[PDB]
Amino acid sequence: MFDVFTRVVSQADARGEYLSGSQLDALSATVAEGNKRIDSVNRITGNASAIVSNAARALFAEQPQLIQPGGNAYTSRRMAACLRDMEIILRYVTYATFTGDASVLEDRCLNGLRETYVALGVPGASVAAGVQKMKEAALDIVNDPNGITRGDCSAIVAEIAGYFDRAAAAVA
Amino acid sequence: MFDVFTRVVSQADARGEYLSGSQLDALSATVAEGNKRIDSVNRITGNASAIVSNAARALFAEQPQLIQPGGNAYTSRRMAACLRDMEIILRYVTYATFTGDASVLEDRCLNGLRETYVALGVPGASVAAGVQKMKEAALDIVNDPNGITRGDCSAIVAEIAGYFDRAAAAVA
Amino acid sequence: MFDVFTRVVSQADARGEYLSGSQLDALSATVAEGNKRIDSVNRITGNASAIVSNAARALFAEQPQLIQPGGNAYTSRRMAACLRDMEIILRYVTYATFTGDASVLEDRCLNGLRETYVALGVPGASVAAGVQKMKEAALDIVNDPNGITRGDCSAIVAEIAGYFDRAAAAVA
Amino acid sequence: TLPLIAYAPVSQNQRVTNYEVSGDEHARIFTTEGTLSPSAMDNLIAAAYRQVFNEQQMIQSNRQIALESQFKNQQITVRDFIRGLALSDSFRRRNFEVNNNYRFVQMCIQRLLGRDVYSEEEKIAWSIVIATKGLPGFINELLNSQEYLENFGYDTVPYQRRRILPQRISGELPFARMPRYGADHREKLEAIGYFRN
Amino acid sequence: AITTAASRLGVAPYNESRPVELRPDFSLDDAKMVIRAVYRQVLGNDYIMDSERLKGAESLLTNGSISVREFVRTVAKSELYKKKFLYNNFQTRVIELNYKHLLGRAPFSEDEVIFHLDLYENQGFDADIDSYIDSVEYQENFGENIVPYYRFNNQVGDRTVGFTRMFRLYRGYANSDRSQLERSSSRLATELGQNTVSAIVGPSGSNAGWAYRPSRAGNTPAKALGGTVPFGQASKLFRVEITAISAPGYPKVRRSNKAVIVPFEQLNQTLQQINRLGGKVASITPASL
Amino acid sequence: MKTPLTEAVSTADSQGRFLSSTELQIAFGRLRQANAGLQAAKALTDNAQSLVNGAAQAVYNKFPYTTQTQGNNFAADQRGKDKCARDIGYYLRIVTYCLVAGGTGPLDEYLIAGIDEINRTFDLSPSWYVEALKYIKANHGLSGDARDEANSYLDYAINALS
Amino acid sequence: MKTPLTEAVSTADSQGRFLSSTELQIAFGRLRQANAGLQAAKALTDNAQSLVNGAAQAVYNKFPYTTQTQGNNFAADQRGKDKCARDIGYYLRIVTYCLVAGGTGPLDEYLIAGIDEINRTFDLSPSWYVEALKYIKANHGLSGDARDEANSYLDYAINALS
Ligand SMILES: *[C@H](C)[C@H]1/C(=C/c2[nH]c(/C=C3N=C(/C=C4\NC(=O)C(CC)=C4C)C(C)=C\3CCC(=O)O)c(CCC(=O)O)c2C)NC(=O)[C@@H]1C
Ligand SMILES: *[C@H](C)[C@H]1/C(=C/c2[nH]c(/C=C3N=C(/C=C4\NC(=O)C(CC)=C4C)C(C)=C\3CCC(=O)O)c(CCC(=O)O)c2C)NC(=O)[C@@H]1C
Ligand SMILES: *[C@H](C)[C@H]1/C(=C/c2[nH]c(/C=C3N=C(/C=C4\NC(=O)C(CC)=C4C)C(C)=C\3CCC(=O)O)c(CCC(=O)O)c2C)NC(=O)[C@@H]1C
Ligand SMILES: *[C@H](C)[C@H]1/C(=C/c2[nH]c(/C=C3N=C(/C=C4\NC(=O)C(CC)=C4C)C(C)=C\3CCC(=O)O)c(CCC(=O)O)c2C)NC(=O)[C@@H]1C
Ligand SMILES: *[C@H](C)[C@H]1/C(=C/c2[nH]c(/C=C3N=C(/C=C4\NC(=O)C(CC)=C4C)C(C)=C\3CCC(=O)O)c(CCC(=O)O)c2C)NC(=O)[C@@H]1C
Ligand SMILES: *[C@H](C)[C@H]1/C(=C/c2[nH]c(/C=C3N=C(/C=C4\NC(=O)C(CC)=C4C)C(C)=C\3CCC(=O)O)c(CCC(=O)O)c2C)NC(=O)[C@@H]1C
Ligand SMILES: CCC1=C(C)/C(=C/C2=NC(=C\c3[nH]c(/C=C4\NC(=O)[C@H](C)[C@H]4CC)c(C)c3CCC(=O)O)/C(CCC(=O)O)=C2C)NC1=O
Ligand SMILES: CCC1=C(C)/C(=C/C2=NC(=C\c3[nH]c(/C=C4\NC(=O)[C@H](C)[C@H]4CC)c(C)c3CCC(=O)O)/C(CCC(=O)O)=C2C)NC1=O
Ligand SMILES: CCC1=C(C)/C(=C/C2=NC(=C\c3[nH]c(/C=C4\NC(=O)[C@H](C)[C@H]4CC)c(C)c3CCC(=O)O)/C(CCC(=O)O)=C2C)NC1=O
Ligand SMILES: CCC1=C(C)/C(=C/C2=NC(=C\c3[nH]c(/C=C4\NC(=O)[C@H](C)[C@H]4CC)c(C)c3CCC(=O)O)/C(CCC(=O)O)=C2C)NC1=O
Ligand SMILES: CCC1=C(C)/C(=C/C2=NC(=C\c3[nH]c(/C=C4\NC(=O)[C@H](C)[C@H]4CC)c(C)c3CCC(=O)O)/C(CCC(=O)O)=C2C)NC1=O
C-alpha cells in the first residue's frame, strides 16, 4: 500500500528524480493537516459502531426489500455479512483518511467488490445508499464542534467525503 | 518429463510398438555423443556465473533503458530477480542439454513464463536478448578447443542453440 | 511480551488493584528517560553490524579453539550460524532496551537457549563471552558523547548492561 | 539465509503407509474442492479455527472476520486461510508470545503438518527459521513444505494425522491437549503475581 | 492490430488474409473463392461434404443471381446451418454462433442476446438470421459483396468485451465451432448476464495451457478482494489459471483446472509447484493494483 | 498485549529485523502521549470509587428492571449489586490500564476478548456496560489531551459491546 | 512501503480492527518527526551533487585500486566512474526518499532487498559503498533530529552492506 509520502516517493523513484521543493512544501502542508486528520480518524473510530448501526437501520427502514423474507439482508448470516460490510467499508475509509491516500481503500477494500456483489446478487445500490448514510453520519460526527479545539477542518472533511464517494461508486 | 531415450520410449508406446533398429541405432549414436554432451553441460555449469554476468552486462549496455530509473531492471530487487531469471533459464537449458530433450525446459521453466512476464510488465524481448547473449557466451565456451580433447561437436552445440532459441521464443 | 508499562499493568492486575501514585511517578520518570532510551536503541541499531563483527573477531582471537579445525565455529555454515546468533542476541537486547523490560529478551531469545546449546554442542561459555564483548562495544557506543547533546545516561547504560548480563547468564 | 541443520526422522505413524479403511477414527476432510453450502463453509471455517486456535480460542474476538469473508468468496485457498489464522494477532499473542521458539515450532508442526515433532532437534532446526525469518517466514516455510502439500495440499483443512490405529481404543495423544504455553510461562505468570490463593 | 500475440492467439492467418470481395463483373474463380470463404466462415470451419454442398445457392451466386450477402443469408437459412448450429444448441449458443459467423465478432452486451432471442421466439430462426444480415454493422463491415470475416482488430464502435469474448468463441485456425471444449454449451451466458470477462486463453499448439475452462461454480474471482492482507507481507497479487493437474491423483486433485490468487513472494513457489505437478499455466492476470 | 512499543517490537520481529527509524517514531509518539495517559490514569484512580458508584446508579436508573425482578443475572439483591459494581470497577481499572500502557491491549487481553460469551452465557446485557462506560465518558472530568486518550479506550469498549 | 502510517494501517487491518490509540500515536510520532525529515531531504537534495562527488572521491581515496587496474567492475575508465557516481546518487536519493517517507521502506523495496547478489554477481565490493555512506555521514551538514534520522538510514544501509 501507499500513503501520502510513499505516493510521491514512488512517483519520484519512477521518474528517477529527487523530491522537488514544492512537493516538500505540500508534504509539510499534509503534516500541518495531520492533527486534524488524526482527530477525524479518532472520531469515526470512536463512533464507528453507532455509525454502522444507524446507517444500517436507516437503510433497512428506507428499503424494506432487503430485510423482507426472501430479501438480500434476510436471515442471520446475510445480515451479519451486511453489517460487517458496513464495518469494513467504514474501517477502510478511516484507513484511507489515516494514510492520506486512497490506495488502501482502492486495493484492500474495493478491488473487485462490485463484481463480487453482482456475482452474489447483492444490490450494490443499497450498499451505496448505506455508504452515503455512513458518509452523512461520519461527517456530522467529525464536524461536531463540541469537546475539541476550534479550527478550519473543511479539507479533511472533503477528503473523507471523497473517500466515501469512492466507496459508494465502487459498489454500483 | 522426458530425456532423449524417454521421448522415443513414449512415442513408441503411443504407437504401441517395439523400437525399430533405426531408433536403436540413433540412440546408440546419442550414447556415443553423450561424452561430448556431458562436456557441454560441465562447461556451461562451470562458467554459469560468468555467462550470466557478462550476458547481463552486454544486455544492459545494449539496452540501457532497463537499468535507468523507471526501468524494469532498475533497483536491487528487480535486478536480483533479473539475474535470478538469467541463471534459471541457463540452468534449465543445461538441464535440457543433459537430458537430450527439451521437456524439462518447456515444462519446468517456460511453463507460464511469458504470462508471468506480461503480467509483471517484464520486457520479454529484453529477456530474449539476454538469452541470446547467454547463447553466444555458451557456444563460445563449449566450442573452446583448449583444455579438452578435440572432436566434432556440431550436433550437441546445435541442440544447445535450439534450446536457447526455444527459450528466447517462449518469452518473446 | 511486556514493556515497561505493561509489566506494571500486569502486576497491578494480578494483584487486583489500580496503580499507586508513586508507581505512576516512576513510570513518568521512565517516560522522561525514554528519549535517552531511544538514543541508545538507535545507536546500537546503527552500529549493530560493527558490534557483532568486532566482538566475534575479539572472541575468536581471545580463544582460538572455536575456529580451529574440529571446533564449533569452524565450517562456513557454523561460522555464519555463530555470526547470526550474535546478530539475533544483539537484536533482542535492542528490543528489550526499546520496551524498557526484559520480557521480549527472556521470552523470545533466552527461554531454553542453554539446553538447546547443550544439545547442539554449542559452547555456552563462549557465547556468553561473545555477549560480554557485545556488551563492551554497545556500552562504548551508547556512552559516546560525540554528536549528541550532553546528559546523564547511567540508568540506560545499567539497563543495557543488565540485559546483556542476563543474556550471558542464560547461556553459561 | 542458511540451510536448515539436518535432523534425523523418528519413527511416527504418519511415516509408514496407511493400510486402513477410513471408517470410524478417520479425520474428516474439510475441503473446498467440492462446491459447498454456506453452512458447510461455516463448519469448514470452524474446523480450521479448531485446528489452529483449538476450541478455547474460538471466541468472537479471535474470529478473523475479513479473512472469513475473503475465504467464502474463494479469494484465498484453505492453505492461505490457515496461513492467515497463523498470522493472526490473536494467534501471535496467545500462542507465540507465551512460548519460546522451540515450543512454538512444536505447536505449529502439530497444528499445521498434523504430526508431532520427531525430537528436540527438529524444534531446534526450525526455531532458527523463526528467529531469522520471523513468524511469517516460518509459517510460510511450513505451509510451502512438501509434507503440508502431499498431506493437505492447497484445499484441505489440516488434521492430526494417524492419531489412532485401526481397532485401537487409544492411540497418540490428541493435538488439542497442548496448551498455549508450557510450564515455563506458567511459572512466569505465577512469579508475576497470578494464579495464587 | 495484433502483431506479437497474433501467432499465439491465432490472429495471424487472419492478419495476412484480406477480405474476399466479389467484383461487379467477377471471374469464375472469384465466385468459387467467395463460395469457399462463405463455407469456411458461415459454417464455422466445419468439414463440408459433397452431399451437403448447397449447389443451388452456389449456382445462384456464380452467375450473379444473388449477391454475396444473399448467398450468406441463403446458407444461413439452410437446413445444413440449422442442423450444425441451431437444432442441437441452446439459444444463447445459437445467438453467439450467428454473431461469430454472420458478423465475425462476439456479442457485446446482454441486450443483443435479448433482442435476438425475443425476435427468434416472436418470429422464428429465419427472421433472426435476417436481422443479423440486415444490420447496420453488417453493411459498414461487409455490405453486399464482401464475405464476413473474423474481426479481431479494433474498429469504430466496438467494445473491448468483444475482444475477449471473440477468443472465447474463436479457438484456433485448425478448429471449428462444433469442435470446441464446451461441446454445445454457450460460452457467454455467464459472461453476458454478469457482464464479466474471463481471461483470454489462446488455442492449442501455441499455448500449453490452452485447455483451461472454468467450472460452473466454485471459481476464483478475477480481482483480489482483500489484497495483500490474507497473505501477510505482499506487494502485488496475481491470479494464475492452471490446467491439467494429474500428478498426485483423485483424492489430492479433484479438479484439473485451478485458478488461484498468489502474491509476488509466493509466485516462484507457485510456478514451481505447477511445474512439479505437471500443470500448465493458462494465463496470469494482475489481480490487485 | 499491544502497546506502541510491543507492536513495534513484534512487527520488527515478524520481519526479523532491527529497529528502524519507524519504530523510533512509534516510541516518540508513545512518549508524547504517555504523560497525558498517566495523568488521566491517575485522575481516574482518584475518582474511581465515585465513578463506579455513579456509573452503577446510572445503569440502574436507565435499566430499572435489573433492580426489580428476580434472577441470577440481575442486581435485585445485594449480591447482584456487588457483582455489577465489581464489573464496572473491572471496566474502569482496565481503562486505566489502557491509559498507562498506551493502547487497547489491556482491554483486548483482559476484558474485550471473550466478552460476548460472558454476556451470552451468564445472560448479561452489554447495554448495561455501555451505559456505565457512557457515564464514565460523561463524568471522567478530563480535558484536552488526556480526555481524547481516555475516551478512545472508553469508546473502544462501546464499539466492542455494541 | 514501510512507514509508520502503512505499518499502522497494515497492523490494524491484519488485526481486522479500527485504528486504536496505538496507531494514532504512531501517526503522532510520524508528524513529530516528519518536518525534520522533510528538511533533511531538502538539505540533501540541495547538496546532493557535491555529496555524491565527494563520496566518490572518498571511495577513490580509501580504495585507490579501483582507479588504476582495469576491469568492468572498477572505475578506472570514464564509464566506471559514471556508474559509481550513479550508484552513489541512487544511495543518496533513496536516503532522501527514506527521510520523506519516515522509514527504511524506500531502502527495503528499492535498495536493500537484492543488493547482496548485486555485490556478488558484478564483483562490487560493499566496502566501497560503505565508505561512500560514511562520507555522506561526515559531510551532510544536518543537526538535531534531521541529523539522527539521516544517520539512521545511512547506518541501516551500512548494516545491510556490512
Ligand atoms: C421480540 C422478542 C423483541 C424485539 C425485537 C426487535 N428485533 C428487531 C430487529 C431485527 N431482528 C432481526 C432478526 C433476524 N433477522 C433475520 O433475518 C433472522 C433469521 C431469519 C433473524 C432472527 C434483524 C436482522 C433485525 C434488524 C433489521 C431489521 O430491522 O429487520 C428490532 C428493531 C431494531 C431496530 O433498531 O430497528 C426489534 C424492536 N424488541 C423487543 O422489545 C421485543 C422484546
Ligand atoms: C586470502 C585469499 C585473503 C585474506 C583472507 C582472510 N580471511 C580471514 C578470516 C576468515 N576466513 C574465514 C573462512 C572460512 N572459515 C571456514 O570455517 C571455512 C570453511 C572451512 C572458510 C572458507 C572465516 C570464518 C574468517 C573469520 C574468522 C577467523 O578469523 O577465522 C581474515 C581475517 C579477518 C579478520 O577480521 O580477523 C583474512 C585477512 N585476506 C587477504 O588480504 C587475502 C587476499
Ligand atoms: C449491507 C450494506 C448490504 C448487503 C451485504 C452482503 N454482503 C455479503 C457478502 C460479502 N461481502 C463481501 C465484501 C468484502 N469481504 C472482505 O474481506 C472485504 C474487504 C476486506 C469486502 C469489501 C464478501 C467478500 C462477501 C462474500 C463472502 C462472505 O459471505 O462473507 C452478503 C452475503 C451474500 C450471500 O447470500 O452469500 C450480504 C447480504 N446485503 C444487502 O442487502 C445490503 C445492501
Ligand atoms: C418465468 C416463470 C420466470 C422468469 C423468467 C425470466 N427469464 C429471463 C431471461 C432469459 N431466459 C432465457 C431462457 C432461454 N434461452 C434459450 O435459448 C431457451 C430455449 C430456446 C430458453 C428457455 C434467456 C436466454 C434469457 C436472457 C434474455 C432475456 O433477458 O430476456 C428474464 C429476464 C432476465 C433478467 O433478469 O434481466 C426473466 C425475468 N423470471 C421470473 O421471476 C420467473 C420465475
Ligand atoms: C473411464 C471410463 C474413462 C477414463 C478416465 C480417466 N480419468 C483420469 C483422471 C482423472 N479423473 C478425475 C475425475 C474426478 N475429479 C473429481 O473431483 C471427481 C468426483 C469427486 C472425479 C470423477 C481426475 C481429478 C483425474 C486426474 C487425477 C487422477 O489421476 O486421478 C485418467 C488419467 C488421465 C491422466 O493420467 O492424465 C483417465 C484415463 N479414461 C478413459 O479413457 C475412459 C473414457
Ligand atoms: C452491572 C452493570 C449490571 C450487572 C452485572 C452482573 N455481572 C455478573 C457476572 C459476571 N460479570 C463478569 C465480567 C467480567 N469478568 C471479568 O474477568 C472481566 C474482565 C476483567 C469482566 C468484564 C463475569 C465473568 C461474570 C460471571 C462470573 C462471576 O459471577 O463473577 C452478574 C452475576 C451473574 C450470575 O449469574 O451469577 C451480574 C448480576 N447486573 C445488573 O443488573 C447490572 C445492570
Ligand atoms: C491519542 C488520542 C489523541 C488524539 C486523537 C489527539 C488529537 C489532537 N488534535 C489536535 C488538534 C486539533 N484538532 C482539530 C480538529 C477539529 N477541530 C474542529 O473544530 C473540527 C470539529 C475537527 C475536525 C474533525 C483542530 C482544528 C486542531 C488544532 C489544529 C491542529 O493542531 O492541527 C491536537 C493538538 C493539541 C490540542 O490543541 O488539543 C491533538 C493532540 N491528541 C491525543 O492524545
Ligand atoms: C536503486 C537501487 C540500485 C543500486 C544500488 C544499483 C547498483 C548497481 N551498480 C551496478 C554496477 C556498478 N557499480 C560500480 C561502482 C563502483 N566501482 C568502483 O570502482 C567504485 C569504488 C564504486 C562506487 C562506489 C561499477 C564500476 C559498476 C559496473 C559493473 C559492470 O558493468 O560490470 C549495477 C549493474 C548494472 C549496471 O551496470 O547498471 C547495479 C544494478 N542498481 C540499482 O538499481
Ligand atoms: C519455474 C521457473 C521460474 C521462472 C521462469 C521465473 C520467472 C520469474 N521472474 C520474475 C520476476 C522478474 N524477472 C525480471 C527480469 C528481467 N527484467 C528485465 O528487465 C530483463 C529483460 C530481465 C532479465 C534479463 C524482473 C526485473 C522481475 C521482477 C519484476 C518486479 O519485481 O516487478 C518472477 C516474479 C516472482 C519473483 O520475483 O521471484 C518470476 C516467477 N521464476 C521461477 O521460479
Ligand atoms: C565428472 C567430470 C568429467 C567430465 C565432464 C568428463 C567428460 C569427458 N569427456 C570426454 C571426451 C570428449 N569430450 C569432447 C568434447 C569437446 N571436444 C571439443 O573439441 C569441443 C570444444 C568439446 C565440446 C564441448 C570430445 C570430442 C571427446 C572425445 C569423444 C568422446 O569421448 O565422446 C571423455 C573421455 C575421456 C577423455 O578422452 O578425456 C570424458 C571422461 N570426464 C569427467 O571426469
Ligand atoms: C528518529 C531518529 C531520532 C532520534 C533517535 C532522536 C533522539 C533524541 N534524543 C534527544 C535528547 C537526548 N539524548 C540524550 C542521550 C545521551 N546524551 C549523552 O551524553 C549520552 C552519550 C547519551 C545516551 C546514549 C540526552 C541526554 C538528551 C537530552 C535529554 C532528553 O531529551 O531526554 C532528543 C531531544 C532533541 C535534542 O535535544 O536533540 C531527541 C529528538 N531524535 C530523532 O529524530
Ligand SMILES: CCC1=C(C)/C(=C/C2=NC(=C\c3[nH]c(/C=C4\NC(=O)[C@H](C)[C@H]4CC)c(C)c3CCC(=O)O)/C(CCC(=O)O)=C2C)NC1=O
Ligand atoms: C477436548 C478435551 C480437551 C479439553 C477439555 C482441554 C482443555 C483446555 N483448557 C485450556 C485453557 C483453560 N481452561 C480453563 C478452565 C478453567 N479455568 C478455571 O479456573 C476453572 C477451574 C476451569 C473452568 C471449569 C481456563 C480458564 C483456561 C484458560 C487458560 C489460559 O488461556 O490462560 C486449554 C488451552 C487453551 C488454548 O490452548 O488455547 C485446553 C487445551 N484440552 C483438550 O484436549
Ligand SMILES: CCC1=C(C)/C(=C/C2=NC(=C\c3[nH]c(/C=C4\NC(=O)[C@H](C)[C@H]4CC)c(C)c3CCC(=O)O)/C(CCC(=O)O)=C2C)NC1=O
Ligand atoms: C473501445 C475501447 C477499446 C480499447 C481501449 C481497446 C484497446 C486495444 N488496444 C490494442 C492494441 C494495442 N495497444 C497498444 C498500446 C501500447 N503499447 C505500448 O507499449 C504502450 C504502453 C501503449 C500505449 C499507451 C499496442 C502497442 C497494441 C498493438 C498490440 C499488437 O501489435 O499486437 C487492441 C488490439 C485490437 C487492435 O489493435 O485492433 C485493443 C482492442 N480496444 C477497444 O475497443
Ligand SMILES: CCC1=C(C)/C(=C/C2=NC(=C\c3[nH]c(/C=C4\NC(=O)[C@H](C)[C@H]4CC)c(C)c3CCC(=O)O)/C(CCC(=O)O)=C2C)NC1=O
Ligand atoms: C487448418 C487446417 C485444418 C485442419 C488441420 C482441420 C482439422 C479438422 N478435423 C476435423 C474433423 C475430423 N477429423 C477426423 C480424423 C481422424 N479420425 C480418425 O480416427 C483418424 C485417426 C483421423 C484421420 C487420420 C475425423 C473422424 C473428424 C470428424 C469428427 C466428427 O465430426 O465427429 C474438424 C471438424 C470440422 C469438420 O468436420 O470439418 C477439423 C476442423 N481442419 C482444418 O481446416
